[PDB]
Amino acid sequence: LTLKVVTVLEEPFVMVAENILGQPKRYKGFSIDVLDALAKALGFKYEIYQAPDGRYGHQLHNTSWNGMIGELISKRADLAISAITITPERESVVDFSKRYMDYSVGILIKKGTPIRTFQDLSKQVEMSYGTVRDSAVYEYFRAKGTNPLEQDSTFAELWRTISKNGGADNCVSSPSEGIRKAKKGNYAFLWDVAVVEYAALTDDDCSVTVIGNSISSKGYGIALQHGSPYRDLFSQRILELQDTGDLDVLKQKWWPHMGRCDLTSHA
Amino acid sequence: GLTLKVVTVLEEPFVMVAENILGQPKRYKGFSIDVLDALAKALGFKYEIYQAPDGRYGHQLHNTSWNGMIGELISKRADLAISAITITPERESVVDFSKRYMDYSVGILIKKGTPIRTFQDLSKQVEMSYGTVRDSAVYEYFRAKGTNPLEQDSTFAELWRTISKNGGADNCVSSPSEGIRKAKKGNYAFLWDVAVVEYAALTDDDCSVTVIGNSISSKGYGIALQHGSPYRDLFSQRILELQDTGDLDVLKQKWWPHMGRCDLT
Ligand SMILES: *[C@@H]1O[C@H](CO)[C@@H](O)[C@H](O)[C@H]1NC(C)=O
Ligand SMILES: [Ca+2]
Ligand SMILES: [Ca+2]
Ligand SMILES: [Ca+2]
Ligand SMILES: [Cl-]
Ligand SMILES: [Cl-]
């Protein structure tokens, strides 16, 4: 039994591993290790391919999705794994396992500013900060920033800067560009805290740090086909790997704080 | 119309008794009740609630049977179980949980005015009684953590030495309501759901207690259904929708009102 796995490159969840010339691509990372653990415990083989458009996928027309979600809908893949958050729109068309890691949004910024919280960022006048335009993060801040029911003004202030002039002034086209702009200075990039944490830990110049928050609204999941017979099985083993600590060990492996950049060097 | 049988246990502010006149059935209220109400409205079912006869969440016994609400689902006396139930692998093996509708972690309830401000501070205590509910999933959590040689710091082992003293008899309590009462009295720190002890501190008549959190979240609260229940996936989808729209945040603010209540700082 061999399962067809679709993925998208994103450090440190899924990364290209060294392969000999003339031999097929290999992959490594936190999500690969989770997948391997499931394959060993459940006893299956798998083969990986990258989404032809490199996209997680969104809806274009009724039933028309691109990206990895589209690959599952058309049943070209049995499952998708990368850094995919569990959302209701995606769960209505495919079937997610229970989460194997929590997701939240963080801030990547150069070390040495007085900014230490999301509230501090929101108080900034004239400072450029933002996220990937037309992303889920963008839409999250839209919803929180236009809702009169928020207890703290923090979200309205952040959205005013992020969305300025339609999101064209302060947002970027990709996480790699956002990471690159934050390292150069005079910009703070809002994105997956796990993604920017790894970028900060491996920064050639150890020049950046990450601000997180207590607000975790979603989990990372494995996406399977609609009606897949394996979804509940994956959920059960994922709960077991969490409870034994195997997941925490893998997280420590791929987000190692010793031997890498000190994110708290300005304290 | 279609009516589901719901089993629960009382834990403030998740499920609480709301009104009980003689000649009328018990009514319930709380965060978990409002989550259940939204699912009932959206999926078109009614429901009737009863309390687990042994008042337990449920765990496995030596003959592989289960007590508590879990046992009520296995026997098919209940169609679903809801209160403040954590999704664990042992339970999911015998019942089917929705995806979580809230995150869970362990906190400490303690009187204000002590130098104890973290779990590490608590673990350093020499003379002090602190613990959790005996024979609970929280007791088993500190057992697993306290006996793990792979733990980086001695904190969990030290906590376990105090919690487990004399097989747990000395420093643990029989119920959360006993743990809360003893922390409010003083000279006892109670370890339990951060959300349960936060409500106790927010609503303290004297505003005399506080909560130490900082514990990372490993688990979620879920609704438990029978094995193979056709409603598990429908519930998960609607829960994800209630989160996405902000409705679950509104309900959390309703039942954990920070403004107008005790300052915990
Ligand atoms: C299993 O053990 C419990 C606790 O002693 C007991 O109440 C129950 O009747 C037992 N069930 C059997 C024999 O299946
Ligand atoms: Ca689905
Ligand atoms: Ca199950
Ligand atoms: Ca099923
Ligand atoms: Cl989940
Ligand atoms: Cl699920």
UniProtKB/Swiss-Prot annotation, chain B:
Residues in compartment: Extracellular: 115-265
Annotated glycan sites: N63
Domain of life: Eukaryota
Localization annotation: Postsynaptic cell membrane
Chain sites annotated for binding Ca(2+) 2: D204, D206, S208
Residues bound to Ca(2+) 1: E92, V95, D96
Summary of the function given for this chain in its UniProt record: Member of the ionotropic glutamate receptor family, which plays a crucial role in synaptic organization and signal transduction in the central nervous system. Although it shares structural features with ionotropic glutamate receptors, does not bind glutamate as a primary ligand. Instead, forms trans-synaptic adhesion complexes with presynaptic neurexins and cerebellins, regulating NMDA and AMPA receptor activity and influencing synaptic plasticity through signal transduction.
Family according to the record: Belongs to the glutamate-gated ion channel (TC 1.A.10.1) family. GRID1 subfamily.
Quaternary assembly: Homodimer. Interacts (via extracellular N-terminal domain) with CBLN1 (via C1q domain), and more weakly with CBLN2; the interactions mediate the trans-synaptic adhesion complexes also with neurexins and are required for ligand-gated cation channel activity.
Protein known as: Glutamate receptor ionotropic, delta-1
Gene source species: Homo sapiens
Top-level taxonomy: Eukaryota, Metazoa, Chordata, Craniata, Vertebrata
Gene it is expressed from: GRID1
Residues of the full protein shown: 436 to 814 of 1009
